C-alpha cells in the first residue's frame, strides 16, 4: 500500500483566515483535517503565485525553475522550463494517476500545459487570474493591461475550451472536475490529486447565498478585525503570548476617517472574501468526503497551503496595470454596494484588510518580509506520528516534492532525465521529522533565500536579513532575530554587524547558485 496524495493550494488566502488558524470564517472541512493533523506556523513559500508554484512542483528555487520573475513582468523563460523535472512527471512514470483541476499559472502554450507537464487528466485556468464566473470585458488595445493578462482561458487536457458551462463558478467547477476524475479513476492504483484554487484571489466574487451569511460581520473594520485575529492566534498557541505585532502601513485612509458609503462597500468586499473562503472550503469537503466514503482518506497524505501572503495590493496604484483601470471598470462593471460580489463587479479588498490576516507579520504579498512569505499549512496523514499538534519547525514549499517522492518509494532521477540535464531539489524530505525521529527537517545552519521584484531576504537558522527598496523600504539590509522578533520590528544591523555580513555572503551565494538577476 503506497499512499495517495492530495495537495490543495489556496490563492492569496491569509495566515489567520481559517477557523483553526485564528479566523472567524466558516471552514469546517479544513478545520477537521487541521485539528487531527499537524498545523505549521513557520512554513514558507515565495512572495508571489507563479514563483511559489514553480517551487512546489520541482523542489527547487523559482529562479532555477523558469519563473525568475512573473511572466507578466519580463531561467527567466516565464514558464516551467526544461532545466527541471516536475513531481507529477516523476509519479506518473512510477504508476500514479496524475489528476488536477485548478489554476495553473505556469504557462499558456500547449507544450507548457499540465497535460504536457505530467497530468493525465486536467481542467485548468492557465493565466494568473480570471473572472470567477467567466464574464469577460471587451478586449482590445485599449483594455487595461491587468485585464488583458487575465482572460478566462481554460484547458481540459489538450482541448482549449471555447465555452464554459452555465452556472460556472471557479471553485465549484474545480470541485466538480476533480471529483469526476476521482470517480473515474482506476481504483486499484494510487493517485496524485492537485487542487489549486483561484479563490480567494481578486476580483472578489462569490454566490450571494454565502455572502449573506457574513452580512454585517465586518462593520467594525480591519483594525478591529486584526485585534480579534491576534487575540485568537495567542489563545490557540499559534503565536507567542507576548509577540509584538508589526505596525500597519498603508497609504489609504483608516477606517474611522472613511465616509459611510465607502465603509459599506469596503465591508461588503470583506464579506464577499469570507464567502469565497467558505465556498472553497465547501468544495474541499465534497472531495474529502468522497475519498472518506471510498475508504481512501487514511492512506491519503493531504497537504493544504496558501501560495503567498494575503493580498494587500491597490491595483489602481500601478499605472503599468492600466492605463485608466478605474475608468474602464466604471464603464464596464457595476461596483455599486448591492452588486459587489457578482460576475459583473470587479473589486479587491486592499492593504488594511490584508494586514489583518498577516498579523503579527510585517506587510503582505509581493514582499520578502514574513507577511509575504509565511503562509498557513497543514498535513493530515495518520501514518505519521507527528499529528494532532501545532509545530513551529521551519519548513518551505521546496520540501514538498522530496517528501512526496520519499513517501511514494521514488528516487529523484538526479542530474539527467529524458536525455536532458536537470536541477536537483534544494529542499529536504519531511519524513524523518514527521515520522517523529527528528524535531525538524532543518537546523540552525540551514540557509534559504528569496528574491523578487527587487526585494531580498536571506535566512540562516532563525536569523533573517531583509532588503526592501524605495519607496517601500529604506533601500538597505535590515537584520532580524525571528526567535525574538517575529514582527521584523527591531533592526539589529548595527548591534550585530558580523551576523549581517555573514548573511550577506550567504545572499551572494544564493544569487550565484540560483541565477538571480
Ligand atoms: O499572481 P499574481 O496574483 O501576482 C501578483 C504579484 C505582484 C503584484 C500583484 Br497586484 C499580483 C498575478 C495575477 C494576474 C496577473 C499577474 C500577476
Ligand atoms: Ca497567489
Alpha-carbon span 503 to 497, nearest angstrom:
10
DSSP β-ladder status, 154-156 and 121-125: antiparallel
- Say how many Å lie between the CA of residue 314 and the centre of ligand 2: 15
- Cell 496558501 sits at which residue? 306
Which atom of ligand 1 is nearest to 149's Cα?
15
**How many CB atoms sit inside 10 A of residue 259's CB?**
8
Question: Who contacts 376 (Cβ-Cβ below 8 Å, separation ≥6)?
Answer: 13, 14, 15, 16, 17, 18, 21, 39, 40, 43, 304, 305, 306
Q: How is residue 222 written as a grid cell?
A: 480591519
Is residue 469 a contact partner of residue 452, using CB atoms and an 8 Å limit?
no
Alpha-carbon span 362 to 376, nearest angstrom:
15
Question: Who contacts 372 (Cβ-Cβ below 8 Å, separation ≥6)?
Answer: 47, 48, 308, 309, 363, 364, 365, 366
Q: How is residue 436 written as a grid cell?
A: 517523529
DSSP β-ladder status, 389-391 and 395-396: unpaired
DSSP per position, 244-297: PPPPP--SSPPGGGS-HHHHHHHHHHHHHHHHHHHHHHHHHHHHHHHHHHTT-G
Alpha-carbon span 397 to 92, nearest angstrom:
21
Q: Is 498 helix (H, G, I), strand (E, B) or coil?
A: helix
Q: Which ligand is located closest to the Cα atom of residue 102?
A: 2
**How many CB atoms sit inside 10 A of residue 465's CB?**
25
- Say how many Å lie between the CA of residue 505 and the centre of ligand 2: 30
- Peptide bond between residue 106 and the one before it cis (omega within 30 degrees of 0): no
Helix axes 260-293, 28-36, angle to 10 degrees: 60
List the determination method.
X-ray
Alpha-carbon span 341 to 268, nearest angstrom:
8
Domain span(s) for CATH 3.30.1120.10 in the chain: 441-517
Is residue 210 a contact partner of residue 182, using CB atoms and an 8 Å limit?
no
Q: Which residues, listed in sequence order, are joined to residue 480 by a DSSP beta bridge?
A: 464
Alpha-carbon span 274 to 25, nearest angstrom:
6
Q: Is the C-alpha dihedral spanning 469, 46, 441, 37 positive or negative?
A: positive
DSSP β-ladder status, 154-156 and 38-40: unpaired
Is residue 466 a contact partner of residue 477, using CB atoms and an 8 Å limit?
yes
Burial class (CB in 10 A: 0-12, 13-18, 19+), 357: buried
Alpha-carbon span 394 to 373, nearest angstrom:
12
DSSP β-ladder status, 43-44 and 395-396: parallel
Fold of 1-440: Alkaline Phosphatase, subunit A (3.40.720)
Question: Who contacts 392 (Cβ-Cβ below 8 Å, separation ≥6)?
Answer: 41, 42
Domain span(s) for CATH 3.40.720.10 in the chain: 1-440
Alpha-carbon span 359 to 371, nearest angstrom:
7
DSSP per position, 395-456: EEGGGHHHHHHHHTT----TTEETTEE-----S--SHHHHTTSSS-SS-TT-EEEEEETTEE
Which atom of ligand 1 is nearest to 73's Cα?
16
Under the phi-then-psi rule, with left for phi > 0, alpha for psi from -120 to 50, and beta for the rest, what region is 107?
Answer: left
Is residue 418 a contact partner of residue 368, using CB atoms and an 8 Å limit?
no
Ligand 1, residues at Cβ distance < 6 Å: 48-49, 70, 72, 128-129, 149-150, 313, 315, 366
Q: Is 379 helix (H, G, I), strand (E, B) or coil?
A: strand
- Say how many Å lie between the CA of residue 49 and the centre of ligand 2: 4
Q: Is 171 helix (H, G, I), strand (E, B) or coil?
A: helix
Q: How is residue 278 written as a grid cell?
A: 467558505
- Peptide bond between residue 201 and the one before it cis (omega within 30 degrees of 0): no
For ligand 1, mutation pick of 306, 319, 365 (most atoms within 8 Å of CB) = 365
Cα Dmax for the chain: 64
CA atoms within 13 A on the CB side of 273: 29
DSSP per position, 296-362: -GGGEEEEEEESSS-----GGG-TTT-SSHHHHHHHH---STTTTTSTT-----HHHHHHHHHTTSS
Sheet of 389-391, strands arranged across:
159-160, 154-156, 121-125, 97-103, 191-196, 4-10, 300-306, 377-380, 38-40, 389-391
Question: Who contacts 95 (Cβ-Cβ below 8 Å, separation ≥6)?
Answer: 189, 190
- Say how many Å lie between the CA of residue 271 and the centre of ligand 2: 20
Question: Could you tell me what percentage of the chain is helix, strand and coil, using 3-state DSSP and rounding each to the nearest 5?
Answer: 35, 15, 50
Q: How is residue 377 written as a grid cell?
A: 499549512
Q: Which ligand is located closest to the Cα atom of residue 202?
A: 1
Which of these CATH numbers, 3.30.1120.10, 3.40.50.2300, 3.40.50.620, 1.10.1740.10, describes 441-517?
Answer: 3.30.1120.10
Helix axes 260-293, 350-358, angle to 10 degrees: 50
**How many residues does the structure list for the chain?**
517
Amino acid at each position: 500500500k503506497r499512499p495517495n496524495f492530495l495537495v490543495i493550494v489556496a490563492d492569496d488566502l491569509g495566515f489567520s483566515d481559517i477557523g483553526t488558524f485564528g479566523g472567524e470564517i466558516a471552514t469546517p472541512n479544513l478545520d477537521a483535517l487541521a485539528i487531527a493533523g499537524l498545523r505549521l506556523t513557520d512554513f514558507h513559500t515565495a512572495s508571489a503565485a507563479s514563483p511559489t508554484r514553480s517551487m512546489l512542483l520541482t523542489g527547487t528555487d523559482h529562479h532555477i525553475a523558469g519563473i525568475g520573475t512573473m511572466a507578466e513582468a519580463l531561467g527567466y523563460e516565464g514558464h516551467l522550463n526544461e532545466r527541471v523535472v516536475a513531481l507529477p512527471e516523476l509519479l506518473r512514470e512510477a504508476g500514479y494517476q496524475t489528476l488536477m483541476a485548478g489554476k495553473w499559472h505556469l504557462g499558456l502554450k500547449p507544450e507548457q500545459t499540465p497535460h504536457a507537464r505530467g497530468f493525465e487528466r486536467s481542467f485548468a485556468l492557465l493565466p494568473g487570474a480570471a473572472n470567477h464566473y467567466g464574464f469577460e470585458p471587451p478586449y482590445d488595445e485599449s483594455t487595461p493591461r491587468i485585464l488583458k493578462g487575465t482572460p478566462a482561458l481554460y484547458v481540459e487536457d489538450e482541448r482549449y475550451l471555447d465555452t464554459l458551462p452555465e452556472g460556472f463558478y471557479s471553485s465549484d467547477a474545480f470541485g466538480d472536475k476533480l471529483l469526476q476524475y476521482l470517480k473515474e479513476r482506476d481504483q486499484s492504483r494510487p493517485f496524485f490529486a492537485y487542487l489549486p484554487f483561484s479563490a480567494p484571489h481578486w476580483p472578489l466574487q462569490a454566490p450571494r447565498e454565502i455572502v449573506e451569511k457574513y452580512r454585517g460581520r465586518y462593520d467594525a473594520g480591519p483594525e478591529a478585525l486584526r485585534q480579534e485575529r491576534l487575540a485568537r492566534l495567542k489563545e490557540l498557541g499559534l503565536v507567542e503570548a507576548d509577540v509584538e505585532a508589526h505596525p500597519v502601513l498603508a497609504l489609504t485612509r483608516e477606517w474611522e476617517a472613511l465616509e459611510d458609503e465607502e465603509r459599506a462597500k469596503s465591508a461588503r468586499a470583506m464579506e464577499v472574501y469570507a464567502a469565497m473562503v467558505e465556498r472553497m472550503d465547501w468544495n474541499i469537503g465534497r472531495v474529502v468526503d468522497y475519498l472518506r466514503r471510498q475508504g481512501e482518506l487514511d492512506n491519503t497524505f493531504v497537504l493544504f497551503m496558501s501560495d503567498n501572503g494575503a493580498e494587500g495590493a491597490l491595483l489602481e496604484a500601478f499605472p503599468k496595470f492600466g492605463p485608466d483601470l478605474l475608468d474602464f471598470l466604471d464603464r464596464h462593471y457595476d461596483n455599486s454596494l448591492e452588486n459587489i460580489g457578482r460576475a459583473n463587479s470587479y473589486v479587491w479588498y486592499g492593504p488594511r484588510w490584508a494586514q489583518a490576516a498577516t498579523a503579527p507579520s510585517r506587510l503582505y504579498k509581493a514582499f520578502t518580509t514574513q507577511g509575504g512569505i509565511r503562509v498557513p499549512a497543514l498535513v493530515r496523514y495518520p501514518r505519521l506520528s507527528r499529528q494532532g499538534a501545532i509545530s513551529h519547525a521551519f519548513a518551505t514549499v521546496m520540501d514538498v516534492t522530496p517528501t512526496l517522492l520519499d513517501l511514494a518509494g521514488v528516487r529523484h532521477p538526479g542530474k539527467r532525465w529524458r536525455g536532458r540535464e536537470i536541477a536537483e531539489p534544494r529542499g529536504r524530505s519531511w519524513l524523518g521529522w514527521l515520522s517523529g525521529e527528528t524535531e525538524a527537517a532543518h537546523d540552525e545552519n540551514t540557509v534559504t533565500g528569496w528574491g523578487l521584484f527587487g526585494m531580498r531576504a536571506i535566512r540562516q537558522g532563525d536569523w533573517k536579513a531583509v532588503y526592501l527598496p524605495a519607496p517601500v523600504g529604506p533601500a538597505t539590509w535590515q537584520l532580524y532575530d525571528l526567535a525574538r522578533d517575529p514582527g521584523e520590528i527591531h533592526d539589529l544591523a548595527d548591534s550585530q554587524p558580523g551576523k549581517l555580513a555573514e548573511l550577506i555572503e550567504h545572499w551572494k551565494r544564493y544569487v550565484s547558485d540560483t541565477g538571480v538577476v
